Amino acid sequence: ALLNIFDIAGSALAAQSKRLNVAASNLANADSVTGPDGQPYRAKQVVFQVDAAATGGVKVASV
């Protein structure tokens, strides 16, 4: 449509922002302990996937 380029780029930007936020949160919680209800803190990562509408944007299903 010559306009899905904006959608693809926006999805890429959102995914990169999510990944950066996760990394920053892990760095902040590097030396934390005993979070809520006492369970130890565990690090998290994100998984990128493509939206097969072929060629499509990137999404993050879950952390």
Which span sits near other proteins by CB under 8 A: 1-9, 10-18, 33-41, 54-62? 33-41
Q: Which residues contact 22 (CB under 8 A, 6 or more apart)?
A: 44, 45, 46, 63
- Rg (the chain; Cα; Å): 16
> Which residue matches tokens 């493509």?
50
Q: How far is the CB of 49 from other proteins (least distance, A)?
A: 36
Q: Which of residues 38-57 bind other proteins (CB under 8 A)?
A: 38
Q: Residues for the chain: how many in total?
A: 63
Of 37, 42, 61, 62, the one binding other proteins by CB under 8 A: 37
Applying CB under 8 A, the residues found at the interface with other proteins are 34, 36-38
